[PDB]
Design a protein around this ligand. Sequence first.
Ligand SMILES: [Zn+2]
Lengths: 52, 636, 109, 96
Amino acid sequence: LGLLPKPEPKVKLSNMMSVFENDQNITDPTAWEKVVKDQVDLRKRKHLEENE
Amino acid sequence: SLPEGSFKRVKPQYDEIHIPAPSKPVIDYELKEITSLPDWCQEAFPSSETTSLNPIQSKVFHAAFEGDSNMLICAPTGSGKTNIALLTVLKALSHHYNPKTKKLNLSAFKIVYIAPLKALVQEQVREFQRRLAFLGIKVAELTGDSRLSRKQIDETQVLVSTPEKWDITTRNSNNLAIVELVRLLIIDEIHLLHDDRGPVLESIVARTFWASKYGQEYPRIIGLSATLPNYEDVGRFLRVPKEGLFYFDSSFRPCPLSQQFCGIKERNSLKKLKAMNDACYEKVLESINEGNQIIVFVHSRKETSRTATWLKNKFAEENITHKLTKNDAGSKQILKTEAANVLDPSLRKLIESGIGTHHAGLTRSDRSLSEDLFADGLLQVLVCTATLAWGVNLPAHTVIIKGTDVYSPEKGSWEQLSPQDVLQMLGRAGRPRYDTFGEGIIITDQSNVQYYLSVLNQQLPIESQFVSKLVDNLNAEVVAGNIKCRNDAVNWLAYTYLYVRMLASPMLYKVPDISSDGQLKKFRESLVHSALCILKEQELVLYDAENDVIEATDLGNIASSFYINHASMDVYNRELDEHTTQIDLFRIFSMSEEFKYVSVRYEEKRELKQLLEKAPIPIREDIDDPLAKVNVLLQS
Amino acid sequence: REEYAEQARPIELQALKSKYTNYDHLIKGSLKDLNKRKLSFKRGKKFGFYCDICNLTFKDTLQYIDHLNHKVHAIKFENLFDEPLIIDVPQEEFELCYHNLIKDFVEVR
Amino acid sequence: TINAQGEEIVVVASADYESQTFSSKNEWRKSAIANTLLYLRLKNIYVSADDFVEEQNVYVLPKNLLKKFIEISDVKIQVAAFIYGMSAKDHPKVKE
RNA sequence: AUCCUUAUGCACGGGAAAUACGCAUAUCAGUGAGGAUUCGUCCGAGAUUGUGUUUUUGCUGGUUGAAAUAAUUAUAA
Ligand SMILES: [Zn+2]
């Protein structure tokens, strides 16, 4: 119904190469590295904030 | 902003925000009645339905008789403007026309009404005839297809002209007597200045003030417009005395416009278009159950027919009968009488379903037919291009604008819907005469909604595009002989509309001078320099940099007379040659800059192909090129 | 609207006759021969073969002539004016008429 | 179109695409369009220069008439006019 | 207060499978379903029936012969 935002893909270091949905996966390689690593560390850090 | 959005609905395909209808006006005033008028003016409103003027009109009217001064009306244009103009006309007539002696003084006053479009000119003229018939006035059209000659202007009193033809009439040196005789200069839709025809209006305005100083009696100038910001700056452009300025917001509109957006969340065009069609269908389904007659605007004319086909198979899949459940016998009759007889763009079937369409590229007769049928109401849904909002007054309860990106040959790129067009599309709405309020709707991409909210609030100034038309206007003026030097040019440019706008916001319109030259002397003179270089290159005018002397050439005079653009002019200059032949003549004609906006079409292409085989005058270009299409149309 | 509901619930004509009677001139609508012409059979297709009696146009020749040989087209042709199509030989037919064939033949020749 | 049915010949209206046409270098279109470039053919003008001899009469032809004749002429088809003049009093053997 | 054991829920992460995962106004079932054995006995949890999906469930992205350029009006006669 659209009350929640459509989920993005869940990237990892393995799914890194295979996700073309978001841009820059090749075009901006190290920025993309910062996006996937920042997103993984964001889910992990969100987990730690949940336990905390 | 918060008051504007009251209520927001979230839907799977799209997020729709529903703006409530505007507020009703506070009454600090008396509604002015008709019996308060003098003897002759009581037939100004021969059908007096209310016997009282609308919220906008009364105050502006009595102010208009009270002062003789330059006036400006920023208004919803809810039919309120027509009567006001009529009444000022009657005043001028009374000033040159005695109350006791009922002989009308014909040769004294002259009147001009500047209506941007030929069709709207026509409509206006019938209105003026109806209202002014009792004095015995000739109200006739001076513009374009009107084809009035040297004499009839002299015979006539009230004139209704389009901006272009009025410009060209007043530019010509011999008629200047008529120009002096005109006391009353009415400018309808002064908001046109935003668009590139607006340059003509500001040039006309400049000519009225600056060009006639030898007789030097300045006519009454009345601007009439949709409500717009920077009204004050507009007055400083014209003369306007502070009291003549009347700013009225949309709260004074006859039918309050309920503003509605659907943001589209999709990106790729194949699903995006489908989502838009689904949204449109949903809106139509909500509307028609209420007995709502509806218009759907689109970008292109080819889009219209396919859209209507989509509504026919989809809408009919849902329910066939409800669109016509009433007078199906007479609907079958009238529908077959209209569609089957004159229509041949395979548009008959759409008419027959009872969802019709109107666009440039539909026959003149078929065109009038579609208008009339949608007026009667056998047409529940009307798919349209942008012609109707701009041209025709006929309102319809629900108005949907489908899409954002329009293709402009100006850029050669897909731009967003321009505010000045969006607004006039929203103007046609629930009918002021019959229905209570309108439904506006904009089918749009969500990212640009943030932009459309603001530009739809009408916070945007009338943009001055004088930069393109400066050169041609200056050339024409030199042909008039009014400018012998750069200083004269910039004095004329002080009465120019870009001048005011530069003063307001120098860096927006790219004034480098800024702090230097409060009057922008050196900026004005620099623009004149820039103009006279390119003009001199086109051998339009004579100019010298250090000595500064101006004179008009023959080519410049020709461009002034036939109102050729400067680009068209230099194109003619080089492309015409001593040895050029019959084949090349058509090619050059096609190259004329006025055809830059022309382009070949895929529905046109079969007839083009049939033509170019049997065409007597050969074409060096080929079917894909618009020039070839132009000159084969010329041959036809 | 009311009229719509109700509907839901000379010498030139003699020349037209003179046309649709003699076929030798009617036979040829093909004068274009091979040519390209740019633009439910009712009220004409603006192209094809024109039958004004029933207001139908036929894209092929055998349909245009065959329909003409059909009774309905002859019934309408008669209902236009008269019934000559249905209209013994007491020797005056070949004497006077045949003599008119020789006479008119020499007049044309 | 005229078409042949079984043991028959019938005039038939056609459709779709028969419209492929060649007509490339021929008829009016291509040569007439090619005619505009004919003023360019007089920028370079040369003849194999024959020995000048007073024994036989010699002709003097102007550059403008020739140019106009070239303009009126065709790239393919032969265009031909007559030419007239008279002997000047400087040389009777010269024909202008 | 620290550390540790079991279970549950919450989730980061890492895998494996979906020929499996279920549901039942159904029947029976530690008051013993269902199986093993060296013949002494041992293990103790689902079994029967019907039915849904099951070369899959919900969403996205790209490529593509799958397909989809507004209006207007100006001459000297
Ligand atoms: Zn017939």
